[PDB]
Amino acid sequence: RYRPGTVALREIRRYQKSTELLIRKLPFQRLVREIAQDFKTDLRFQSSAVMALQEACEAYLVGLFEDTNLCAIHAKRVTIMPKDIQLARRIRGE
Amino acid sequence: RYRPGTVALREIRRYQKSTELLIRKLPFQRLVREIAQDFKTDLRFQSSAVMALQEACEAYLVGLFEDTNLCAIHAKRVTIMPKDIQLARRIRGE
Amino acid sequence: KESYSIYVYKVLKQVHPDTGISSKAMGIMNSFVNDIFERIAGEASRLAHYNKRSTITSREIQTAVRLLLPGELAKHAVSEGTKAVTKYTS
Amino acid sequence: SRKESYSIYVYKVLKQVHPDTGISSKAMGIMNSFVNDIFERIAGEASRLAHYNKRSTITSREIQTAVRLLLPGELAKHAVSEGTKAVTKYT
Amino acid sequence: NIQGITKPAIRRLARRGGVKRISGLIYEETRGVLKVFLENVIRDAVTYTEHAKRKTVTAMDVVYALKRQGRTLYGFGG
Amino acid sequence: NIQGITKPAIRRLARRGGVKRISGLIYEETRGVLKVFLENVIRDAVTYTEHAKRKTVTAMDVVYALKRQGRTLYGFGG
Amino acid sequence: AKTRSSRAGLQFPVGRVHRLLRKGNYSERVGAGAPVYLAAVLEYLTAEILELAGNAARDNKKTRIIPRHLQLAIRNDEELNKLLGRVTIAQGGVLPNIQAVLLP
Amino acid sequence: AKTRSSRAGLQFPVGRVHRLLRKGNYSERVGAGAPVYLAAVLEYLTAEILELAGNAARDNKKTRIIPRHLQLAIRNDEELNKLLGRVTIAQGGVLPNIQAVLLP
DNA sequence: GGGGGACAGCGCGTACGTGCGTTTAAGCGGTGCTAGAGCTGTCTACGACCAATTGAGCGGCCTCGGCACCGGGATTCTGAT
DNA sequence: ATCAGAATCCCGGTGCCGAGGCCGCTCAATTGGTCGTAGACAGCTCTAGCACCGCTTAAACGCACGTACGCGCTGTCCCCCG
């Protein structure tokens, strides 16, 4: 049995040394369509439009998780919590 | 004697109500000239140019201290330290 | 020089007939008008070229104000612009 | 419908710096986006400089100043050298 | 549809961000900030689509929306 | 000349920022941060001055420099 | 002579706005309605800030608007604070704000 | 006949760059040296990135540059990173970076 | 100079990493349809321009009454007791 | 509480000095005719997005379980506040 943390660090090295999208495509596509429905109805989407949204969202969330981690370490913790996400966004101006 | 913190909070209340510049003008002017000397020699400065620089710098330091303060509180501290300034700037992208 | 001082004062009398304004506050207002003017015109420009158009219409301005201005400020600004164009055309 | 791009020029420069190295279509798209982006930044700053000085013409001087303002540290130093050399050779 | 962003997916994004240990309340928080981000980009992209009198959001519409929100994306025509 | 930014001045800036307690190492850190900020703005302002073939940095040069670094200033002619 | 401003029922200058659009290197051509629309929108924004700033002046026992009043009007409302996020009002100061944990 | 790119000794298109400056309407007029200067700068920047990206490709034993190699070249260079700070490279991934407190 | 906040040590114990085989549905490839993007042609209705103008906008000049800041009195802060 | 005493509100005065009221006038906005050309719009077309279907299979899931990291509690010592 690997000690808590060992497999987590192995996953960090796997995902940092790779470039693929980490959100499942079909569920993400459904979310994009559902959100766009509130702005206009019967909206079509080029497949490349949805993929461009995917790429930007994943990049944004990875970048936010990096800053959230720094906030947690600053509070002498190794666990990220909502207060860390909130601080990062507040300082970023979001 | 007022307990440590009482006069500090009174000063916060006074400076957050005022809009005057908090850095002495003549020392600031000297700093601006000396920094500009490294870019171009025999540089003259409009009086309003130095005032524009002072207004921007003070607004930058006040904004940064706000973000620094919020990072100290995140570490459960009431005292700002260099690590707080460093985190704020890192998250801001500076 | 040219400034928007006269027009800012005219609008100040309409909203607040007994209220004046300092020269420093007037300078802030002039900077504000110039800044927003530039944001809108620049977005309208990009929006024209992106649709391969050579002409800046009220449609480009409306869309720029529909992207720049937040929430209800866009709603009211669009109403004001549409009313002005309608009155002008008649 | 013909859509112009900088692909041919990216390929030419690649073959000069690394003769045995190719490039994927995805990587080519990144390079095209990069050139277009930098081109907008420089031209837009040069446009501002001209209007700020009441001038109607964007010249090599405006481009050089824009390059100083946008490119950081030594990227500006070398970019200015390249631009100056090209103008001298062209004249 | 927001639940389609599963906990494993949010863990993978955190792993790429270098995060080892995650609280259980992070998943709902992340879903929230993702929704806000997507809404803001999609709103602007649809505005561009409507201005072009189109019924199909193009990759260019998304690229323009990202560019104006200061999140320039390279690789979709930039 | 950087020492002209005295501890009391830095304290006043912190008080406006809502800071109640300050460590002794903050004063030197703040001086360094201010120096970097000033250098960056003055560099660009002087570039504008040299482009105008002027020997005097104008308020407009400073305003333009701040604008391009995303710190738009109102009150000095733009 | 009925000024385009008077034709649109506006206090802001349509003719000047038209010239600034034509000389501002924005496009090759400018429609007749574009300056009218821009002038209106721009005047709406000025009215909104001035109304809120005049209220702040009256609250502070003053009859003249100063940069402080403008800062108070902008920073204490969401949409105006968002629009002018990356902006600094000279001699505007800041909003009185102390973290609750710092309170006695 | 000699093309303006060949007269400037450049691989980038001076004639196309001139047209794109003239039809941005970025100004009323465009000098003859402006497109030459701009083309040379664009060429220099592309060469720098491609050189660094080709090195990254060789260090992963690849003969074709992919977005990953471009991301590696830009993020590993302080100046290129600073120039392309608010840029996202599609399929570029991230630098391998783990905070020391999280390690074994 | 003093005193109260930062730091250290620790119990502890409960929040969450790991497995495991379970319960879910992503996704990849195929099948047809057709909303609609985009091209081609036109006609043309709105803008650029040219020439006279005139009436607001702006430089200049004054008077004023709004407000910076002076002296007094008050009340509610806060610390010693 | 309990009072001492600064800190801060608040009131009448003041003069003075920037804001606004007011004059002179000029040049840039206006009015009106002519040209042209951009784009508003009708039809075509065939491209791409969409809905639907089979099968699969890799991924999400619940919970049982260990454990170690998050935080409450105590004690110190000396750094900043005044």
Author numbering:
A (entry chain a), B (entry chain e): 40 to 133
C (entry chain d): 34 to 123
D (entry chain h): 32 to 122
E (entry chain b), F (entry chain f): 25 to 102
G (entry chain c), H (entry chain g): 14 to 117
Article passage:
RNA polymerase II (RNAPII) is a central transcription enzyme that exists as multiple forms with or without accessory factors, and transcribes the genomic DNA packaged in chromatin. RNAPII consists of twelve subunits, which are highly conserved from yeast to humans. To understand how RNAPII functions in the human genome, we isolate transcribing RNAPII complexes from human nuclei by chromatin immunopurification, and determine the cryo-electron microscopy structures of RNAPII elongation complexes (ECs) associated with genomic DNA in distinct forms, without or with the elongation factors SPT4/5, ELOF1, and SPT6. We successfully visualized four structures of the RNAPII ECs with DNA or nucleosomes existing in human nuclei: (i) EC transcribing genomic DNA, (ii) EC transcribing genomic DNA with SPT4/5, ELOF1, and SPT6, (iii) EC paused in the downstream nucleosome, and (iv) EC with the upstream (reassembled) nucleosome.
We next determined the structure of an EC associated with a downstream nucleosome. In this complex, EC paused in the downstream nucleosome, at approximately 20 base pairs (the SHL(−5) position) from the entry DNA site. Elongation factors, such as SPT4/5, ELOF1, and SPT6, were not detected in this EC. The nucleosomal DNA region is peeled by EC until the DNA position is bound to the H2A L2-loop, in which the H2A Arg77 residue may capture the DNA backbone. Consequently, approximately 20 base pairs of the nucleosomal DNA (the SHL(-7)-SHL(-6) DNA region) are detached from the histone surface. In addition, the nucleosomal SHL( + 0.5)-SHL( + 2) DNA region directly contacts the RPB2 lobe and RPB1 clamphead. These histone H2A-DNA and EC-nucleosomal DNA interactions may be responsible for the EC pausing at the SHL(−5) position. In the EC-downstream nucleosome complex reported here, there is no space for ELOF1 binding on the EC-nucleosome interface, due to the direct contact of EC with the nucleosomal DNA. Interestingly, previous genome-wide studies have consistently revealed that EC is predominantly paused around the nucleosomal SHL(−5) position in cells. The existence of this complex suggests that the SHL(-5) pausing may commonly occur in a DNA sequence-independent manner during chromatin transcription. Despite such heterogeneity, the structure of the EC-nucleosome complex is clear. This fact indicates that the EC pausing at the SHL(-5) position of the nucleosome is not a DNA sequence-specific event, but instead may be a common feature in chromatin transcription.
